[PDB]
């Protein structure tokens, strides 16, 4: 009984250590993923803007060439 | 700082020479009609003068110069540039005075909708909704803008954004005591989350909120609603939400404040509650 | 006679609740009329109507014992069709009634 | 002092329950944002492909016309 | 009856240790990797802004030259 | 709403104007021979009217107008733009008419894969399989589409997507088709993951499903495959799945339904089912005699 | 089946048309001087033929067609299309015969480094290292490619890719009885992981492996290295790694082979090891 209870105490202290480590690790998870989500959002916006601008650029350049 | 106010002053002088450019448009462009690029560079100097103003920490002046450049730039050509300038003016006006930011954002919305860009229109609608919520007290306008953005996003199979917009609207409605819309949205989103394995675990909260908004309106239907959620989702009763709800609705059958007061205090003993849920419970359990 | 959709409501008065009669609006029905309340193809329950002025047209009121026996809830939509009792057969000669204390 | 150990074990059990529940609650929303990021990511990928194809064809046609 | 108490205790500790070590080892690699995607998307941003500026200047110069020729 | 009705009215006006524009263009071609600006402008009008119309809450005719514009554009030796418009029209028809969307998506797949792009073709095949299986109750052509998508993905060494598609195909096959293909696919995916940097501890489930399929075939095959998995994967030896399946096999050998019932019930109680293990277990129980 | 056969037949027709095209086009260039459009059309025909060959599941001939198109295009004084064709040929040759895939990928690397770009060069180097490792046994070439890629990554400030390449190189070196280089790389990466708010959790593993590989040499050096590592990282003693190292050190010190084996078995039971670490521990037990 003594050995079993001592082993259980070791197991519980390991429980708290591991769970707290994983918890801090997880808040880091969340922070990093939110930052990446924001910055990909900005990149997607800029992608759409560039696509539209370059499409109208080709359109007007081809129209100008046709004018020649 | 004030070395940036000095260049702000010479940016005002640049706006003055742009006034000279419009005077040229008045008088001298009769012979320089081909100087459309002159008007374009006049708009460019307007825009960079607005940029110097922004760097000078004059938000009102920066927004005014941005909107003036946008107005001078929409000469039936390069409409996208005019829309970008208008949204920049709105961003500049977000701080200080955001009222005209609202109108310029509507103008950008109209430009994009005519062009056909729906994602940008919905995002700007969400932006104006949030500026209303954070600046003004009107929620109805924010609710309408969020619903409209959700409609755009669902029109192009952008389901997640519409789902979140509807979730926010339903939460506000439950706080705004419109329980039919809240229950419908909560059950719809719960069923949608149940569809995919990724959001399979989340259905418990949505079912709980739908059941709460059911139980507030018609107490007897609370039993039927919790039952229906349970067979529809066999792993809903196991959830603490369903057990707690059953405890509250069964205690309410007999008039004993101690029972459900102890229940809610125990529930708060394991996890802190939110303003929405706490206010809901305090309102509902009074009668 | 064919049955029309309505809304289940709560009984307005304690005595009417004790009367065990579905409280209905005068504009929609009459006291003494018998109806069959259908909530689903397999759930039909027969009621006797008692008119009260407070009943809004377009809804039917049931008391809490009635709303528990009949599986009816406030705000729910319920189709009510008039019911005819065969008096040569359905007149209750002797009914076996179980009784118990409602309140402990 | 085994009863004191049992009481401490109960308290630690409660603490573990709270911590695990908080972790699960945050994990659910972590799922939701990963879904959102993937949703946006697919659209940006498709837009990139479209712009690349339009640009290849446009520049090639212009170069051919130049000759 | 303490035998089954010990049996459940050893099962509890065994499963706890293995599963906890699994999570601890697993998360590390993924989150070491996420920074690589972050910096790749940084490079995407840099190249893309340069690309956009390049086309903007090229198109405006082409329009100006075409107007000059006419 | 006034906006919707006005959008629908102006879209009809624009469609009529586009039809008259194409008629006048075919007339002017012989009349004046202006080139091809007229046809491109008519296509532009059609596309603008179609986008406004799909903004107008109406979908079917918007997709039809997009298809017409795409056809007229492809008439001008333009393919990628026409193919993209075809894809958009199919997406619009998704909620209006599945068959038109399916046909447009086939045309887009053919043109794209002829160009040289396989990833878009594979994604379109996955979309076809999803749209078919989600609303139409059938698998076989969905299985074919998943297999084609996996093949296209593997052609460019994109292993993850092809593996996922093959896993889905094998799961559907086991649910409905014979278990040989499912057994082979599950065993392959399980054995190709002993060294997985991040999947070191789930090959057990794949091998367990393969063993369950073996048991659904025959007891002797069940046990032989059970050993094969045991020695092949040492970690699987200590897995709870190993003990559960061995207990189930030894129970089924002796013809005692009670042991099987208690084992399955305990397994369900400790851990939830998956709707696929339960069906196979019930089919096994049906043959206890 | 039928699709593959039809693709192969159409592709054979296209190839025959392509040889006819190249022959008649060179003849017409000689006799009429029509420019270079015909050569470009022939190159595009070759590219489409290679694409349809890959469709037909004939990777050797598809890669041959890609290489032919690359050679023809670079003969036309253009690089990027030639490099893309060469890398596509390598991808086709990746399966079946990768030696010519290796050669064409090396040519692609050569042209890319001639242009001046780094990232693609390092990616191709690591790809060739992977090809050598998976299809060949000459791990030395893989080590050299990893070294070149790591140098490029470190120079371009891409610390993550360089760290990964260095870790792989150290693993391979310590695998082939080389410890000094392995010791240096492992301790360097561990030190690099000191201040990392995230990699700090992983910093211990590199030090543990470094201590083991250093202990492959002698005992006293291992004790000094491990105590130095503990002093550098005060919390390293918290993990089971330090106690395991100390126990193994004393067990080897007092020739307690059975105790060493029992401790290794206990560690394996609590956490299974890999082939490499088990080999290292058995090698340690040999003396």
Swiss-Prot record, chain A:
It comes from the Eukaryota. Expressed predominantly in cerebral cortex, hippocampus, cerebellum, adrenal medulla and retina with weak expression detected in non-neuronal tissues. Residues 2-64 form the t-SNARE coiled-coil homology domain. It is found in: Cytoplasmic vesicle, Secretory vesicle, Synaptic vesicle membrane; Cell membrane; Synapse, Synaptosome. The record marks 63-64 as: (Microbial infection) Cleavage. There is a cross-link at residues 62-63, 66 (Glycyl lysine isopeptide (Lys-Gly) (interchain with G-Cter in SUMO)). Phosphorylated by CK2. Part of the SNARE core complex containing SNAP25, VAMP2 and STX1A; this complex constitutes the basic catalytic machinery of the complex neurotransmitter release apparatus. The SNARE complex interacts with CPLX1. Interacts with STXBP1. The interaction with STXBP1 promotes assembly of the SNARE complex. Interacts (via C-terminus) with KCNB1 (via C-terminus); the interaction increases in a calcium-dependent manner and induces a pore-independent enhancement of exocytosis in neuroendocrine cells, chromaffin cells, pancreatic beta cells and from the soma of dorsal root ganglia (DRG) neurons. Plays an essential role in hormone and neurotransmitter calcium-dependent exocytosis and endocytosis. Part of the SNARE (Soluble NSF Attachment Receptor) complex composed of SNAP25, STX1A and VAMP2 which mediates the fusion of synaptic vesicles with the presynaptic plasma membrane. STX1A and SNAP25 are localized on the plasma membrane while VAMP2 resides in synaptic vesicles. The pairing of the three SNAREs from the N-terminal SNARE motifs to the C-terminal anchors leads to the formation of the SNARE complex, which brings membranes into close proximity and results in final fusion. Belongs to the syntaxin family. This is Syntaxin-1A. The gene is Stx1a.
Swiss-Prot record, chain C:
It comes from Cricetulus griseus (Chinese hamster). This is Vesicle-fusing ATPase. Homohexamer. Interacts with GABARAP and GABARAPL2. Interacts with GRIA2. Interacts with PLK2, leading to disrupt the interaction with GRIA2. Interacts with MUSK; may regulate MUSK endocytosis and activity. Interacts with CDK16. Disulfide bonds: none annotated. It is found in: Cytoplasm. It comes from the Eukaryota. Belongs to the AAA ATPase family. The gene is NSF. Required for vesicle-mediated transport. Catalyzes the fusion of transport vesicles within the Golgi cisternae. Is also required for transport from the endoplasmic reticulum to the Golgi stack. Seems to function as a fusion protein required for the delivery of cargo proteins to all compartments of the Golgi stack independent of vesicle origin. Interaction with AMPAR subunit GRIA2 leads to influence GRIA2 membrane cycling.
From Swiss-Prot, chain E:
Residues 3-65 form the t-SNARE coiled-coil homology domain. Palmitoylated. (Microbial infection) Targeted and hydrolyzed by C.botulinum neurotoxin type A (BoNT/A, botA) which hydrolyzes the 197-Gln-|-Arg-198 bond and inhibits neurotransmitter release. It is found in: Cytoplasm, Perinuclear region; Cell membrane; Synapse, Synaptosome; Photoreceptor inner segment. Residues 1-59 are annotated as: Interaction with CENPF. It comes from the Eukaryota. Keywords: Cell membrane, Coiled coil, Cytoplasm, Lipoprotein, Membrane, Palmitate, Phosphoprotein, Repeat, Synapse, Synaptosome. One of its GO terms (cellular component) is synaptobrevin 2-SNAP-25-syntaxin-1a complex. One of its GO terms (biological process) is exocytosis. A lipid is attached at residue 69 (S-palmitoyl cysteine). GO terms for molecular function: calcium-dependent protein binding; lipid binding; myosin binding; protein domain specific binding; SNAP receptor activity; SNARE binding; syntaxin-1 binding; transmembrane transporter binding. t-SNARE involved in the molecular regulation of neurotransmitter release. May play an important role in the synaptic function of specific neuronal systems. Associates with proteins involved in vesicle docking and membrane fusion. Regulates plasma membrane recycling through its interaction with CENPF. Modulates the gating characteristics of the delayed rectifier voltage-dependent potassium channel KCNB1 in pancreatic beta cells. Belongs to the SNAP-25 family. This is Synaptosomal-associated protein 25. The lineage of its organism: Eukaryota, Metazoa, Chordata, Craniata, Vertebrata. The chain holds residues 17 to 86 of 206 of the full protein.
